[PDB]
Coordinates of C-alpha atoms and ligand atoms in Angstrom, one line a residue:
Chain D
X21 CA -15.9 -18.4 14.6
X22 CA -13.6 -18.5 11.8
X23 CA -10.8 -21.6 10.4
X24 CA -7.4 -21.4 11.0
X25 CA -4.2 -21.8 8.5
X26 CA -4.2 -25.9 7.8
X27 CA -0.9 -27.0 8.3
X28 CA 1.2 -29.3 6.6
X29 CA 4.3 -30.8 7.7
X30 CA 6.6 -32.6 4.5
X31 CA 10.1 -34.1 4.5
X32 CA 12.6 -32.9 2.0
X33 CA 12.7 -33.9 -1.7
X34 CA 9.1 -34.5 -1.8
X35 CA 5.7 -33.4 -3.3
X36 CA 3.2 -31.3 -1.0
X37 CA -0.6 -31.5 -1.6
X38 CA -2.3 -28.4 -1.0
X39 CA -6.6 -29.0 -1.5
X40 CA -8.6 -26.2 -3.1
X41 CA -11.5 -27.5 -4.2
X42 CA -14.9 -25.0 -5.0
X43 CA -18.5 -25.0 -5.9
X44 CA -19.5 -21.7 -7.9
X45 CA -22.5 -20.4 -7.5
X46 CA -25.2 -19.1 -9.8
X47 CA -24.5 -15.6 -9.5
X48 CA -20.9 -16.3 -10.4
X49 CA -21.1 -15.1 -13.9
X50 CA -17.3 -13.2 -14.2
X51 CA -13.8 -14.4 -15.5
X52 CA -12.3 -17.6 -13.7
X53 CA -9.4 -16.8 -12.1
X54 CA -6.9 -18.6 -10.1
X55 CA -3.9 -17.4 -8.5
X56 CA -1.6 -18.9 -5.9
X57 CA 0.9 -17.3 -3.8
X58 CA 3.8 -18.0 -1.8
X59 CA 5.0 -16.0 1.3
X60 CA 8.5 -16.6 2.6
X61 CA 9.2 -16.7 5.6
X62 CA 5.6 -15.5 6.2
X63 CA 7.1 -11.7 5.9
X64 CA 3.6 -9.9 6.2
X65 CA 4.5 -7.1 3.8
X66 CA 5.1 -8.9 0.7
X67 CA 3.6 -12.4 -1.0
X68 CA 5.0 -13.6 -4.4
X69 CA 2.6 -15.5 -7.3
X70 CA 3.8 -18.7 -8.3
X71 CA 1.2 -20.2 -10.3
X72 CA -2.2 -18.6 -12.1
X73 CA -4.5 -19.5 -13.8
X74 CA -6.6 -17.0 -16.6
X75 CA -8.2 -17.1 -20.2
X76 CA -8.2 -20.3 -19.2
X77 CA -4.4 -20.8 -19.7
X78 CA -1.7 -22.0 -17.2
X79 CA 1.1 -19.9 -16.4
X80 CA 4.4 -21.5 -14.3
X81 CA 6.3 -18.7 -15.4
X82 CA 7.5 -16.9 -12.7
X83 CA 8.9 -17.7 -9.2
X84 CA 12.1 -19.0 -10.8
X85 CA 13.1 -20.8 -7.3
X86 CA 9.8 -22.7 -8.5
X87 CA 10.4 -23.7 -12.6
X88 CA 9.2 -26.4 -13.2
X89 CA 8.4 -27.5 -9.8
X90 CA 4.2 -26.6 -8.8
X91 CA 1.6 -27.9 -11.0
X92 CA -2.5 -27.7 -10.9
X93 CA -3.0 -32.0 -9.4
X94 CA -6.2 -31.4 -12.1
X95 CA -7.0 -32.0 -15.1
X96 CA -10.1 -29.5 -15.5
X97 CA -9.8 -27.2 -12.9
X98 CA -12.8 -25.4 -13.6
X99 CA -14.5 -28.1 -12.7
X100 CA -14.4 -26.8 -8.8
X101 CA -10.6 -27.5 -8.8
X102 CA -7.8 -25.3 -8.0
X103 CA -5.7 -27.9 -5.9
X104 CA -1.6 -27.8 -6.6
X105 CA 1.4 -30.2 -6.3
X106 CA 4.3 -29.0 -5.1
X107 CA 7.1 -31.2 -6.2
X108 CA 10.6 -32.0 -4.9
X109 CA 10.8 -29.9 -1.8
X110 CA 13.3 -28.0 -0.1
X111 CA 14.2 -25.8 2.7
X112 CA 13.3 -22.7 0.6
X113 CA 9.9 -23.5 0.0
X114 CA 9.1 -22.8 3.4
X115 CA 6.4 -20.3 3.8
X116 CA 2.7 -19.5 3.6
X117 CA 0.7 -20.7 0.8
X118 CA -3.0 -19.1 0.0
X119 CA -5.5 -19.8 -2.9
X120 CA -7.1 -17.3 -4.1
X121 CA -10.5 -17.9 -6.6
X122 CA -12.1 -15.0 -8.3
X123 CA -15.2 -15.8 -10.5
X124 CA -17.4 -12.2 -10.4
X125 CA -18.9 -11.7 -7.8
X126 CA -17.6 -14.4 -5.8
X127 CA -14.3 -15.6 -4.2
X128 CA -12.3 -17.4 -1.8
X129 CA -9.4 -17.9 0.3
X130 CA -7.5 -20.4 1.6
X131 CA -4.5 -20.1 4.0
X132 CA -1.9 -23.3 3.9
X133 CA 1.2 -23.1 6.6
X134 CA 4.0 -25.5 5.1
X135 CA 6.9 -26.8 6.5
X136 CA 10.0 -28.8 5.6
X137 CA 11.6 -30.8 7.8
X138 CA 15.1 -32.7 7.1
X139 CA 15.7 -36.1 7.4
X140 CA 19.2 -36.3 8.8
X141 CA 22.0 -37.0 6.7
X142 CA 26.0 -35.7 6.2
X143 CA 26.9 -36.6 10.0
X144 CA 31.1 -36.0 10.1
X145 CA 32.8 -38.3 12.5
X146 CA 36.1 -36.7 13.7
X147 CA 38.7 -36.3 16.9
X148 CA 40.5 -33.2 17.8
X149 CA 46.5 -38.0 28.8
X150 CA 45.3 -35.6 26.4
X151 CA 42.2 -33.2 26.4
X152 CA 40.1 -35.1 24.1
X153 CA 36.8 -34.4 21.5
X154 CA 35.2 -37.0 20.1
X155 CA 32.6 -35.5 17.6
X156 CA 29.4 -36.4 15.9
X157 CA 28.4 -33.2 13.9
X158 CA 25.6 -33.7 11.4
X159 CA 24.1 -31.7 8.5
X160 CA 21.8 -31.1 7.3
X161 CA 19.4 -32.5 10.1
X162 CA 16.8 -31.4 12.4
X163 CA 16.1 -31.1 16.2
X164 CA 15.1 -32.6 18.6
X165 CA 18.2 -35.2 17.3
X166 CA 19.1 -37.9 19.6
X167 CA 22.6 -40.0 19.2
X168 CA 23.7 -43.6 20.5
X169 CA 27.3 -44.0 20.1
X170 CA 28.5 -47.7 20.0
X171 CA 31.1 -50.4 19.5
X172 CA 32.0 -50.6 26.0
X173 CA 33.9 -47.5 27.6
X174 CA 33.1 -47.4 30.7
X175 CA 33.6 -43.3 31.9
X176 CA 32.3 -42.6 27.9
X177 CA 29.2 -44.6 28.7
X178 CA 27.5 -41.9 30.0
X179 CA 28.1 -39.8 27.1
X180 CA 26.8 -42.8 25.3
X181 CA 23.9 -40.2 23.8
X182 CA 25.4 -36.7 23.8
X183 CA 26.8 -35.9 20.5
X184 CA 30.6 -34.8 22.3
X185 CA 32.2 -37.3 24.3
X186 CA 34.6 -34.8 25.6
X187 CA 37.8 -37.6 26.4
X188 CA 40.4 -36.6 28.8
X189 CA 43.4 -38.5 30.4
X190 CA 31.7 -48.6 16.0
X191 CA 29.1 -46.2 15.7
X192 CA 27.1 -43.0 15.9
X193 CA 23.6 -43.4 14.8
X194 CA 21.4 -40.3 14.3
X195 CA 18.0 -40.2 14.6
X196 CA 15.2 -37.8 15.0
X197 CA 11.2 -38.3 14.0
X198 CA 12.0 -38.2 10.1
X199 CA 15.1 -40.1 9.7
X200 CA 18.0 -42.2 10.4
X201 CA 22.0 -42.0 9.5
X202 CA 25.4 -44.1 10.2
X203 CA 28.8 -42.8 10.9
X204 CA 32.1 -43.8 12.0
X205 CA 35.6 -43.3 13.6
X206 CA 38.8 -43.7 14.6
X207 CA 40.9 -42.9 17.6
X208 CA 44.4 -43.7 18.8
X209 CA 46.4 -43.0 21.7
Chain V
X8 CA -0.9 4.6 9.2
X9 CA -4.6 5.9 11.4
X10 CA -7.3 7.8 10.4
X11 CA -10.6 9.0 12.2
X12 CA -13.5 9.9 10.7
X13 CA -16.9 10.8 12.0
X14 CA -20.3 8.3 11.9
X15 CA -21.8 9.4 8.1
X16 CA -18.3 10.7 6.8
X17 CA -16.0 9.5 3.8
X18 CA -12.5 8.0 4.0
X19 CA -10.0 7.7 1.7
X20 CA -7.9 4.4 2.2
X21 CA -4.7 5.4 -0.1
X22 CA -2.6 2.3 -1.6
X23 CA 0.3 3.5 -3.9
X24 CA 2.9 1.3 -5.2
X25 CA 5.7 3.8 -5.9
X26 CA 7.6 2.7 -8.3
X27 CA 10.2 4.5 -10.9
X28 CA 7.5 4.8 -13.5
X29 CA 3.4 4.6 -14.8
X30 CA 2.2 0.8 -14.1
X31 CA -0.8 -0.2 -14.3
X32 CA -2.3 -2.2 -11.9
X33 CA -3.5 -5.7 -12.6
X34 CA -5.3 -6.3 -9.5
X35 CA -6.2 -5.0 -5.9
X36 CA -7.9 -6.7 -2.6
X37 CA -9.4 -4.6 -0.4
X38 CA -9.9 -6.3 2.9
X39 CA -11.2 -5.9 6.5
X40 CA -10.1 -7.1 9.7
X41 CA -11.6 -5.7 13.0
X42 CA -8.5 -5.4 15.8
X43 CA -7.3 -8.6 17.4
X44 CA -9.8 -11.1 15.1
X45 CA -8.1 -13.2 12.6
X46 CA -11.8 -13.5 10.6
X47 CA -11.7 -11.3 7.8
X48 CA -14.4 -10.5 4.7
X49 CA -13.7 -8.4 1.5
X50 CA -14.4 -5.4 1.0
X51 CA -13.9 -5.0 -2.8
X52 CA -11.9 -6.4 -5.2
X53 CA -10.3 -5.4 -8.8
X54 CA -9.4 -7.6 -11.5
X55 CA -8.7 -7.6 -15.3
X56 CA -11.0 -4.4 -15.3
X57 CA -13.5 -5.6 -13.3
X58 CA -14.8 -4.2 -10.0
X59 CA -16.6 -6.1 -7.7
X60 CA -17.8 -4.0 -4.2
X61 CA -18.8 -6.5 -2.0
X62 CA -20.7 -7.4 0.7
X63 CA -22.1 -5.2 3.8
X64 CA -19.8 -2.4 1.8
X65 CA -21.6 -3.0 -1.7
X66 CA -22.9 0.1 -1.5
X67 CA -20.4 2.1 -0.1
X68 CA -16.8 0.8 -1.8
X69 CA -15.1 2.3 -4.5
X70 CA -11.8 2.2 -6.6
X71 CA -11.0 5.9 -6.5
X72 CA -6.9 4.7 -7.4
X73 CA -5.8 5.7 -10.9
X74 CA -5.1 2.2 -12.4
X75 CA -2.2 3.4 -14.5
X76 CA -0.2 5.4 -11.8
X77 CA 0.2 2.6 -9.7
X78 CA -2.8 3.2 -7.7
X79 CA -5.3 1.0 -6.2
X80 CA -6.6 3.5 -3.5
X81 CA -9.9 2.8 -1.8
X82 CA -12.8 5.3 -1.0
X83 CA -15.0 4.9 1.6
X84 CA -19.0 6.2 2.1
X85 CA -20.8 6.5 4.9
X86 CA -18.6 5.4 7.6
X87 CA -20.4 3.6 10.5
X88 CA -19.3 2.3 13.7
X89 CA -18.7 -1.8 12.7
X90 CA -16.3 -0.1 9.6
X91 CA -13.6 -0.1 13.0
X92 CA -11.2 -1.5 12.1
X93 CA -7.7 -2.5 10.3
X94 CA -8.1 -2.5 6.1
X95 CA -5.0 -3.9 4.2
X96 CA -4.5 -3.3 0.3
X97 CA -3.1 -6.4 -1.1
X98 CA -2.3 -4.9 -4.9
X99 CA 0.2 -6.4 -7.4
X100 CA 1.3 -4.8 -10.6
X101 CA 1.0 -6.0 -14.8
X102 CA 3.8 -7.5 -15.7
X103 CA 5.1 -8.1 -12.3
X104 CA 4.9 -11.3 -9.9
X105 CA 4.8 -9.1 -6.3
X106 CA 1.9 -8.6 -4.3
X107 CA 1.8 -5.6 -2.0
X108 CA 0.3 -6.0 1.2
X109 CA -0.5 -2.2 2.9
X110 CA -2.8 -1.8 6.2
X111 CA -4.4 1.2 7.3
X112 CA -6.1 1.7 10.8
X113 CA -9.5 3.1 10.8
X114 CA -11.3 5.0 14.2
X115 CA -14.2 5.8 14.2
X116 CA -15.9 8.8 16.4
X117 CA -19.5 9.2 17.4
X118 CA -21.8 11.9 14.7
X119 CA -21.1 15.1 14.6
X120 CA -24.2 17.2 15.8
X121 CA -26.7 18.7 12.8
X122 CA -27.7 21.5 15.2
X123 CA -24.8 24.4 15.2
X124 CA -25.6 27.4 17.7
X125 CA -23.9 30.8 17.3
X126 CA -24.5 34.0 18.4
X127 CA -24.8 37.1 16.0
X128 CA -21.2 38.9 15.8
X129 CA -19.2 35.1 16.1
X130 CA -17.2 33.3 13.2
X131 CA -18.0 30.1 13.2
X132 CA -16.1 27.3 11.8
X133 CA -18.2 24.7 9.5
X134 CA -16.3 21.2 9.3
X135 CA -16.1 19.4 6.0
X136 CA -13.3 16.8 5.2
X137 CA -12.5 13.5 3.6
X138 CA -10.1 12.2 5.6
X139 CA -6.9 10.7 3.5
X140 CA -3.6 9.4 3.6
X141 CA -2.9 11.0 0.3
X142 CA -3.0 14.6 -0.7
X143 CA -4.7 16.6 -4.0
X144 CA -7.5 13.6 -4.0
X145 CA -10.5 16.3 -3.6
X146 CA -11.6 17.3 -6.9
X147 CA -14.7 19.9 -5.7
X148 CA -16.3 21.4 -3.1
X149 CA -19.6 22.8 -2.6
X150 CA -21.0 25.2 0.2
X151 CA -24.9 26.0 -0.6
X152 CA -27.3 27.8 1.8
X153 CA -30.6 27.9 2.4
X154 CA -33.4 28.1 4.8
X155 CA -34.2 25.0 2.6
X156 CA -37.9 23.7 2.9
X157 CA -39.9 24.8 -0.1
X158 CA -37.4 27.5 -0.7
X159 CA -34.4 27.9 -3.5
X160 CA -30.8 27.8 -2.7
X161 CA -27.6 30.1 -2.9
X162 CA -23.9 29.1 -3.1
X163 CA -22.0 30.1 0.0
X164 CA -18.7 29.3 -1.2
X165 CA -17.2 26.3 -4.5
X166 CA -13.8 25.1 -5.1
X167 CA -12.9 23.2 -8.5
X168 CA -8.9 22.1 -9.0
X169 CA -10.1 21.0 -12.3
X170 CA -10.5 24.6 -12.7
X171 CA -8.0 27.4 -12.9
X172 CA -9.5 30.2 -10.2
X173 CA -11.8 27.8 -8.5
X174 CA -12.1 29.8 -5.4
X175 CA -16.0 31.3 -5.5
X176 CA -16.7 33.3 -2.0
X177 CA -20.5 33.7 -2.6
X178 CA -21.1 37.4 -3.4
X179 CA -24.6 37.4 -1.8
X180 CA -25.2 37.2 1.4
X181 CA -21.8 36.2 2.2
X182 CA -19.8 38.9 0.9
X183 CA -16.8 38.9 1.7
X184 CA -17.2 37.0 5.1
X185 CA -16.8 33.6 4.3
X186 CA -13.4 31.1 3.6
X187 CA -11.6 28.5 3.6
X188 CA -10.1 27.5 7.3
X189 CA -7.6 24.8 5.4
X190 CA -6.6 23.4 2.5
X191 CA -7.9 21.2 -0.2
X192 CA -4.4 19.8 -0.9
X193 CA -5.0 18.1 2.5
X194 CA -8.5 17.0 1.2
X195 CA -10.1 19.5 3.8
X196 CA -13.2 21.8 2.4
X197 CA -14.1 23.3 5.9
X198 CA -15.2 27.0 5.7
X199 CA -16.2 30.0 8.4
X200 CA -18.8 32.2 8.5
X201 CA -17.2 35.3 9.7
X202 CA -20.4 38.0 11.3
X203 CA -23.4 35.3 12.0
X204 CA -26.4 37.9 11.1
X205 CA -29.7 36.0 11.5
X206 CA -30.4 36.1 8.1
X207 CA -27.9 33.6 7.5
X208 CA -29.6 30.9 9.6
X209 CA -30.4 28.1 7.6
X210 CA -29.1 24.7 5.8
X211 CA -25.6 25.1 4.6
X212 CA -24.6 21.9 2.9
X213 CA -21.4 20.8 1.4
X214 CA -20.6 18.7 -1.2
X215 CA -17.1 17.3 -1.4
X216 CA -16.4 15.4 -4.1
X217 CA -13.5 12.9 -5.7
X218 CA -14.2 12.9 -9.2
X219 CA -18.3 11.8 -9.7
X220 CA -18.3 10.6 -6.1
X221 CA -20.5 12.7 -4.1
X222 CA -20.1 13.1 -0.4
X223 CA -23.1 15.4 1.4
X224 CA -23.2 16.8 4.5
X225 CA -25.8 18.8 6.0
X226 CA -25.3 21.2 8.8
X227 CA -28.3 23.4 10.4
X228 CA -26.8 27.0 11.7
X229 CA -29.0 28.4 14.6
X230 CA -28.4 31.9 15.1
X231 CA -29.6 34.4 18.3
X232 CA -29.4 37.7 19.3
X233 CA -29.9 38.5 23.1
X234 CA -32.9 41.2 23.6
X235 CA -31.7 42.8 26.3
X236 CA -34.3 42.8 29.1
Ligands
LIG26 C1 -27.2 -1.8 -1.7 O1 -28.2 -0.9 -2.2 C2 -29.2 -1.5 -2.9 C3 -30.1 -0.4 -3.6 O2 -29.3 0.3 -4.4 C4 -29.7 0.5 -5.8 O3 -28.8 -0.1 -6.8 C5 -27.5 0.4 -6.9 C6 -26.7 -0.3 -8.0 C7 -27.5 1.9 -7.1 O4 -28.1 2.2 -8.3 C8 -28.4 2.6 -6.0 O5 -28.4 4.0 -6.1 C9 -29.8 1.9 -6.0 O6 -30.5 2.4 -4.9 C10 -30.0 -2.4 -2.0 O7 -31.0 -3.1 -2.7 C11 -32.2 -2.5 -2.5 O8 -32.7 -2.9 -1.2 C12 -33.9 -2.3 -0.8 C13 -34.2 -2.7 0.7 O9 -34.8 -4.0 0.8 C14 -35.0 -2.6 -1.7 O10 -36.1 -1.8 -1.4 C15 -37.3 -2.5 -1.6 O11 -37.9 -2.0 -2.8 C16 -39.1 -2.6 -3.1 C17 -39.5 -2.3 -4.6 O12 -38.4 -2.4 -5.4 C18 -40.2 -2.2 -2.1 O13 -41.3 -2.9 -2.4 C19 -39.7 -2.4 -0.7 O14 -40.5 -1.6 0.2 C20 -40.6 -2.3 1.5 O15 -39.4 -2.1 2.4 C21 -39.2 -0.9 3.0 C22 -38.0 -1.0 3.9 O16 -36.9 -1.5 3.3 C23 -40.5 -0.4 3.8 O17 -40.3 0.9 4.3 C24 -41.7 -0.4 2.9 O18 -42.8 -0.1 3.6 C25 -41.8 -1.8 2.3 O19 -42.1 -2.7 3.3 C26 -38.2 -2.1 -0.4 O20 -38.0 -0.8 -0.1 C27 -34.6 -2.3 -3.2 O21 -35.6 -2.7 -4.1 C28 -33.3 -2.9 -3.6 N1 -32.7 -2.6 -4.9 C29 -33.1 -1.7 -5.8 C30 -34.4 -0.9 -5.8 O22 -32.4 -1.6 -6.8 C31 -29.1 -3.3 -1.1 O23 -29.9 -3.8 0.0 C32 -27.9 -2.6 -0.6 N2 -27.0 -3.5 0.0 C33 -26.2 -3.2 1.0 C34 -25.2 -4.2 1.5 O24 -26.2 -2.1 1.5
LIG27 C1 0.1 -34.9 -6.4 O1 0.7 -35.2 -5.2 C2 -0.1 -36.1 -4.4 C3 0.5 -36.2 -3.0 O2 1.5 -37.2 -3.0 C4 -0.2 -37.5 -5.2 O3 -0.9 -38.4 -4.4 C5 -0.3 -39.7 -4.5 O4 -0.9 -40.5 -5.5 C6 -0.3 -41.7 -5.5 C7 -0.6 -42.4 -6.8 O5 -2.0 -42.7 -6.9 C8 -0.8 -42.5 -4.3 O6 -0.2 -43.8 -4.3 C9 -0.3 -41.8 -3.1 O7 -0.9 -42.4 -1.9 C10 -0.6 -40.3 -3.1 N1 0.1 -39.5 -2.1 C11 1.3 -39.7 -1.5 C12 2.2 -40.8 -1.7 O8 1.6 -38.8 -0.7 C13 -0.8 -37.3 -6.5 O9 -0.7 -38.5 -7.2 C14 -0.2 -36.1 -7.3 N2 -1.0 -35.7 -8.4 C15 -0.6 -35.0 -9.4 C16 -1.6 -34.6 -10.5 O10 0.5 -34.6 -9.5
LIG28 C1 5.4 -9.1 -19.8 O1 4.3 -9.7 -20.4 C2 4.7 -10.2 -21.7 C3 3.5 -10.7 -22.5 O2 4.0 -11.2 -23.7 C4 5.8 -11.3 -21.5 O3 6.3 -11.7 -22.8 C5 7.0 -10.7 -20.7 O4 7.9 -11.6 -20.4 C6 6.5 -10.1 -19.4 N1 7.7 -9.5 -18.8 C7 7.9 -9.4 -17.5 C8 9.2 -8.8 -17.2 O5 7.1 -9.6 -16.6

């Protein structure tokens, strides 16, 4: 029986909290060292350090999709500490996160699945006996989106929540489990 | 990338970060994964010049890779039946922010028999190997003979890259009628035995070695001659 990857689900522009906490143990006599790496896209052949910690100094200076962006939450991290803050996040910093501890002879791992979802926002409202398109595309955003179109057309009403209301012979508000949005247009005939 | 070795056997689990130059390796994890089980458990691990075999392959573990050419290859002892399994290098380079991650599949086949039985008049092929996924890694060999209990030793046959002419067929009792079946630049020490007298049944045992690491094996040559009755 063995633990699986926690997994943590953030919005965008926001800090992710990733616990690794430790108790050394007597025999643990060697170097401290922490190191923290990020997998894109989970690719299985390659991992990339963002933060590590040795001689018991900090170093943030690689990963520069990451400058100035993941810090150690603790003060003292020796003290049994390795969490890390991820701050302002984006769609890039999707991936597979792992802590790795090394004190001689013991260690650890810790596997952390993170994902960014999108609170939608940057909906476009725009039209095309005509063969009508009325058109509420969003982005960025994520699925599954649901849309309620607004104003009392009666043969639209049924399109009243499909994101086309495909018009032949006021609102559109966005939604999905993260976030809302607003948008609006104009027609004539 | 598969390899087989026997029950007893050494393995060498290469893991070579080829680069366009000499780089020395800041660290290496070595770790085991039996097929279709996410648990996992360390094997051995290499860091700022310290290395740390661990666990049920305390023993058995060791950093055989050159740390300055790029190299962070594993070596194997005593192979045994729960060692089946997938092994991945995860290795990353000074002055470098990339981790490598590298598997290898390991098989593993039953023993091979101690007991060897020839008649007098056959060659007869004696199997010693480290099995590898790199090439050059055997340093020496050793073949020595004897009907070994209370009783001295000969050399059948020694190879030594480190040396210029290392090829040594024995001279003795094996004049002339003993030789390599393959090639040490594929890490394989096997020898025959070309006209099995009885007096060469005994204990040949070689000795195959990468650098100070000594692997042994031990095989018994029964020999018979039918009266004819
Ligand atoms: C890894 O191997 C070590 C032993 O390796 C030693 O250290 C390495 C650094 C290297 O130098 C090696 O060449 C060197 O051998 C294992 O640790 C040993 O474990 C054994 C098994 O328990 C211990 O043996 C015990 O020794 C006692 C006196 O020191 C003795 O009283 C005991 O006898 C009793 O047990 C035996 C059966 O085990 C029984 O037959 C007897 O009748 C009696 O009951 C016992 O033998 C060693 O002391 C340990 N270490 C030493 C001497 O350094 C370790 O277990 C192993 N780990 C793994 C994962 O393989
Ligand atoms: C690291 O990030 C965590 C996760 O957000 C921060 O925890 C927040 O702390 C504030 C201030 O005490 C609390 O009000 C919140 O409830 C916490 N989490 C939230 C809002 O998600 C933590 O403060 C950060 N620590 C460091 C050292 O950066
Ligand atoms: C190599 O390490 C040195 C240590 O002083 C550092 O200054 C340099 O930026 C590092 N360079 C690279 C390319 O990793």
């Amino acid at each position: 029986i063995t633990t699986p990857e926690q997994r943590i689900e953030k919005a965008k522009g926001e800090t992710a909290y990733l616990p690794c906490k430790f108790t050394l143990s007597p025999e643990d006599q060697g170097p401290l060292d922490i190191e923290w790496l990020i997998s894109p896209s989970d690719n299985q052949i390659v991992d990339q350090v963002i933060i590590l910690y040795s001689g018991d100094k900090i170093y943030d200076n690689y990963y520069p999709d990451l400058k100035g962006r993941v810090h150690f939450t603790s003060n003292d991290v020796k003290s049994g500490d390795a969490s890390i803050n991820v701050t302002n996040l984006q769609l890039s910093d999707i991936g597979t996160y792992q802590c790795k501890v090394k004190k001689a002879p013991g260690v650890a791992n810790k596997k952390f699945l993170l994902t960014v979802l999108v609170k939608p926002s940057g909906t476009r409202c725009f039209v095309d006996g005509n063969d009508f398109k009325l058109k509420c595309e969003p982005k960025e955003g994520s699925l599954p989106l649901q849309f309620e179109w607004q104003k009392m057309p009666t043969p639209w009403l049924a399109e009243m929540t499909s994101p086309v209301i495909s018009v032949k012979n006021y609102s559109c508000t966005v939604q999905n489990r993260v976030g809302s949005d607003q948008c609006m247009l104009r027609l004539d005939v | 990338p598969q390899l087989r070795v026997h029950v007893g056997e050494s393995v060498l689990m290469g893991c070579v970060v080829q680069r366009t130059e000499e780089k020395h390796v800041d660290r290496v994890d070595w770790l085991f994964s039996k097929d279709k089980d996410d648990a996992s458990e360390y094997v051995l691990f290499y860091y700022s010049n310290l290395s740390v075999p661990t666990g049920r392959f305390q023993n058995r573990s060791h950093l055989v890779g050159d740390t300055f050419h790029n190299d962070g290859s594993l070596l194997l002892q005593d192979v045994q039946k729960a060692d089946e399994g997938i092994y991945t290098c995860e290795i990353r380079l000074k002055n470098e922010s990339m981790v490598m991650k590298k598997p290898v599949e390991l098989w593993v086949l039953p023993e091979e028999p101690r007991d060897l039985r020839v008649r007098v008049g056959d060659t007869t092929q004696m199997r010693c190997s480290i099995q590898s996924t790199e090439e050059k890694r055997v340093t020496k060999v050793n073949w020595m003979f004897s009907s070994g209990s209370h009783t001295e030793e000969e050399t059948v046959l020694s190879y030594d890259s480190n040396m210029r002419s290392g090829k040594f067929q024995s001279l003795g009792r094996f004049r002339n009628r003993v030789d390599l079946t393959g090639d040490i630049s594929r890490n394989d020490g096997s020898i025959k035995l070309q006209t099995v007298k009885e007096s060469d049944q005994g204990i040949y045992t070689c000795s195959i070695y990468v650098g100070k690491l000594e692997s042994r094996k031990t095989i018994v040559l029964h020999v018979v001659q039918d009266e004819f009755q």
